[PDB]
Amino acid sequence: IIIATKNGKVRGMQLTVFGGTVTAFLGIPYAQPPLGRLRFKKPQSLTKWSDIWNATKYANSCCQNIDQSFPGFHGSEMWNPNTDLSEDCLYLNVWIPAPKPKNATVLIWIYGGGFQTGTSSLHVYDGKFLARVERVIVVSMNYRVGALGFLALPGNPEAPGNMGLFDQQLALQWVQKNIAAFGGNPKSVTLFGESAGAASVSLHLLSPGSHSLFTRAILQSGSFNAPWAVTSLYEARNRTLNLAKLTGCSRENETEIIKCLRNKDPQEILLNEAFVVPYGTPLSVNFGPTVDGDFLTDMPDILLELGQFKKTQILVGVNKDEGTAFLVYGAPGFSKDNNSIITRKEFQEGLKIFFPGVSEFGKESILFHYTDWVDDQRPENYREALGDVVGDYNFICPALEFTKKFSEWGNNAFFYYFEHRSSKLPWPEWMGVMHGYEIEFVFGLPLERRDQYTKAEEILSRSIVKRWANFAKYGNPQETQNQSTSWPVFKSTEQKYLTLNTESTRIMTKLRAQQCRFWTSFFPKV
Ligand SMILES: *[C@@H]1O[C@H](CO[C@@H]2O[C@@H](C)[C@@H](O)[C@@H](O)[C@@H]2O)[C@@H](O[C@@H]2O[C@H](CO)[C@@H](O)[C@H](O)[C@H]2NC(C)=O)[C@H](O)[C@H]1NC(C)=O
Ligand SMILES: *[C@@H]1O[C@H](CO[C@@H]2O[C@@H](C)[C@@H](O)[C@@H](O)[C@@H]2O)[C@@H](O)[C@H](O)[C@H]1NC(C)=O
Numbered sequence: 001i002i003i004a005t006k007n008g009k010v011r012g013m014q015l016t017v018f019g020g021t022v023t024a025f026l027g028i029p030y031a032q033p034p035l036g037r038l039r040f041k042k043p044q045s046l047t048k049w050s051d052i053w054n055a056t057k058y059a060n061s062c063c064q065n066i067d068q069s070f071p072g073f074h075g076s077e078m079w080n081p082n083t084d085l086s087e088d089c090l091y092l093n094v095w096i097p098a099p100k101p102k103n104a105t106v107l108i109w110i111y112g113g114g115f116q117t118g119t120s121s122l123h124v125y126d127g128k129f130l131a132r133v134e135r136v137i138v139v140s141m142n143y144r145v146g147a148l149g150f151l152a153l154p155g156n157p158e159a160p161g162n163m164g165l166f167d168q169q170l171a172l173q174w175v176q177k178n179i180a181a182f183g184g185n186p187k188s189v190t191l192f193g194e195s196a197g198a199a200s201v202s203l204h205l206l207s208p209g210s211h212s213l214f215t216r217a218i219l220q221s222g223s224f225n226a227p228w229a230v231t232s233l234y235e236a237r238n239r240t241l242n243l244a245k246l247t248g249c250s251r252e253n254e255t256e257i258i259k260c261l262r263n264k265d266p267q268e269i270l271l272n273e274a275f276v277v278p279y280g281t282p283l284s285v286n287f288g289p290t291v292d293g294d295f296l297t298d299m300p301d302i303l304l305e306l307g308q309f310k311k312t313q314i315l316v317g318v319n320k321d322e323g324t325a326f327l328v329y330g331a332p333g334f335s336k337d338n339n340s341i342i343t344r345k346e347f348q349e350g351l352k353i354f355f356p357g358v359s360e361f362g363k364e365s366i367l368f369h370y371t372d373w374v375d376d377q378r379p380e381n382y383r384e385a386l387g388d389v390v391g392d393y394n395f396i397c398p399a400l401e402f403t404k405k406f407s408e409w410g411n412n413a414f415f416y417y418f419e420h421r422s423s424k425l426p427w428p429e430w431m432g433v434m435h436g437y438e439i440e441f442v443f444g445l446p447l448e449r450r451d452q453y454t455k456a457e458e459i460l461s462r463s464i465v466k467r468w469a470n471f472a473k474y475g476n477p478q479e480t481q482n483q484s485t486s487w488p489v490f491k492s493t494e495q496k497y498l499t500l501n502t503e504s505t506r507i508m509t510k511l512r513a514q515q516c517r518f519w520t521s522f523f524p525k526v
């Protein structure tokens with residue numbers, strides 16, 4: 001199977017999925033490799049080729065530091081890259097139904113990873129099941145991460161910032177120009193992503209250069225207003241200059257600093273990335289999105305508040321235990337290999353780990369609001385409070401606030417609370433419904449019965465896949481055939497949301513109301 005694109009012919013490959021066929025095009029380039037003098041610059045358009053490009057294997061993943069905290073442990077290593085790292089990584093993937101559809105809705109995945117890690121080739125992002133089951137086209141792209149994707153000397157085109165977001169954008173542009181050749185509908189494109197990918201999707205809603213490149217948006221466990229998602233111009237410059245000092249590249253002319261960093265091996269860049277901040281946390285985003293005056297024309301909180309974003313439907317949600325995964329990356333007393341019953345003193349020390357630049361009063365105010373116990377004698381009280389602190393502050397309250405503010409300008413929004421812990425989850429049970437572990441359900445891995453998920457998880461994934469596909473196709477995440485709970489729109493008054501679990505799917509109101517009033521109204525003042 002050969003498809004003529006606007007830059008040349010590409011060859012795909014046939015997959016057998018659930019007794020049917022999916023055509024996969026893996027590793028289509030969508031930009032000039034950003035190498036040599038193109039490192040740190042915006043992605044450049046692609047010169048045509050005359051041969052047949054063989055898109056039959058996942059391409060290189062972008063340079064990035066690896067999670068080496070639990071060698072040999074699938075719970076962490078399933079997120080590490082599974083193809084060679086290379087600066088030559090600006091490639092994308094396309095899964096199309098077989099037989100070739102006529103005007104199929106398109107789903108574009110943007111992976112997360114704190115804007116420092118990630119790759120589209122991960123097993124849990126395999127789009128062949130979505131294409132097979134729902135006859136949508138799935139596209140995913142690699143984009144630059146870390147300093148190579150987000151280094152910023154604001155205003156300087158040698159390193160303007162937001163390059164990895166512009167990589168994402170050029171890929172959406174590729175889908176606009178080429179996807180009809182694959183049987184896709186460029187007028188029916190839904191972006192979806194998780195964590196930093198979700199924050200990325202939310203910034204595409206704010207960026208005027210992305211408004212004509214997609215229809216709708218899905219935001220899984222993330223949004224730009226999360227406290228880790230946007231770097232200020234002060235810190236971005238301080239971090240670029242710290243990286244220059246760490247590499248021997250300090251110069252007076254800012255452009256000569258970039259030229260010096262262009263001659264450094266990617267490994268020297270990657271090795272010094274962690275130290276550009278003084279106080280890291282397990283959630284540090286050393287190099288990430290900034291207000292560059294190009295992709296982002298103003299501080300995104302201002303754009304959100306004043307209604308300056310794409311008017312369309314959104315689907316947004318969070319997981320029950322967003323915060324727990326980060327506790328075993330530094331909080332004292334915590335371990336994935338025991339039950340992590342921590343004391344009050346260990347709790348207080350954990351706040352210092354997760355809020356290092358925050359005043360004593362600010363840390364006490366966290367302790368005061370989260371340690372008013374239903375039972376003082378419950379031994380896991382402090383262990384659970386710290387997970388909820390990290391989860392509510394970093395993910396759940398920003399997602400709820402994004403959805404509130406977004407829906408106030410008249411658009412339909414749908415909010416979910418994912419509370420199913422995967423039966424295959426390799427992390428311990430005290431970490432619950434972890435950050436990142438709805439993705440496999442969204443992508444339909446539990447539909448593969450050979451893979452030891454329960455039957456109840458097959459059913460849950462099947463229903464989630466249908467709702468996601470109906471949202472992309474029709475702007476409405478219902479499952480209309482199997483007497484399913486109707487998913488109501490989220491309004492800023494009543495704030496209804498839908499719970500996703502294997503027992504009973506429920507309509508609830510005002511998620512984490514007391515906790516989020518603390519984080520959204522009081523804590524930003526400290
Ligand atoms: C749970 O484990 C943590 C982590 O300790 C490590 O992992 C264990 C599973 C075991 O292999 C230990 O030998 C390892 O050191 C424990 O936290 C440590 O506690 C000791 C004494 O309390 C202290 O000296 C260390 O600094 C702690 N490690 C930290 C803070 O990272 C914790 O006590 C264990 N909790 C339970 C309930 O078993
Ligand atoms: C591109 O691929 C052509 C055909 O490859 C066919 O499919 C792959 C997956 C292998 O199974 C191969 O044995 C098949 O014949 C090649 O003929 C051609 O040389 C390739 N082009 C380049 C530039 O590598």
Ligand SMILES: *[C@@H]1O[C@H](CO[C@@H]2O[C@@H](C)[C@@H](O)[C@@H](O)[C@@H]2O)[C@@H](O)[C@H](O)[C@H]1NC(C)=O
Binds near residue numbers: 243275277
């Ligand atoms: C800004 O930068 C100052 C210098 O940072 C120091 O040197 C670099 C190379 C790193 O190793 C870093 O860890 C060092 O602390 C800092 O002193 C300062 O705190 C930074 N931040 C702010 C807000 O000023």
Ligand SMILES: CN(CCc1c[nH]c2ccccc12)CCC1CCCCCC1
Binds near residue numbers: 282284285325435
């Ligand atoms: C050390 N961890 C760095 C990643 C990171 C840095 N900064 C962020 C900001 C938001 C979300 C994630 C990050 C990796 C955390 C992952 C989380 C996914 C589930 C279990 C595996 C462990």
Ligand SMILES: CC(=O)N[C@H]1[C@H]([C@H](O)[C@H](O)CO)O[C@@](O)(C(=O)O)C[C@@H]1O
Binds near residue numbers: 075336337338426428
């Ligand atoms: C150090 C270590 O590997 N410990 C134990 C692991 C992990 O604690 C969990 O899988 C969560 O990471 O779990 C086991 O009990 C299990 O699941 O059979 C085996 C093993 O003794």
Ligand SMILES: *[C@@H]1O[C@H](CO)[C@@H](O)[C@H](O)[C@H]1NC(C)=O
Binds near residue numbers: 102103185187188
């Ligand atoms: C695909 O659908 C759009 C409307 O969503 C329509 O304008 C376009 O002509 C269609 N293309 C086909 C059917 O090839």
Ligand SMILES: *[C@@H]1O[C@H](CO)[C@@H](O)[C@H](O)[C@H]1NC(C)=O
Binds near residue numbers: 253254255
């Ligand atoms: C910095 O170097 C660049 C590269 O030649 C040059 O164009 C620019 O004018 C220099 N800036 C200053 C202030 O000298």
Ligand SMILES: *[C@@H]1O[C@H](CO)[C@@H](O)[C@H](O)[C@H]1NC(C)=O
Binds near residue numbers: 481482
């Ligand atoms: C609806 O129910 C049938 C069984 O009656 C099941 O096979 C099918 O997968 C369900 N569809 C969805 C979209 O959940």
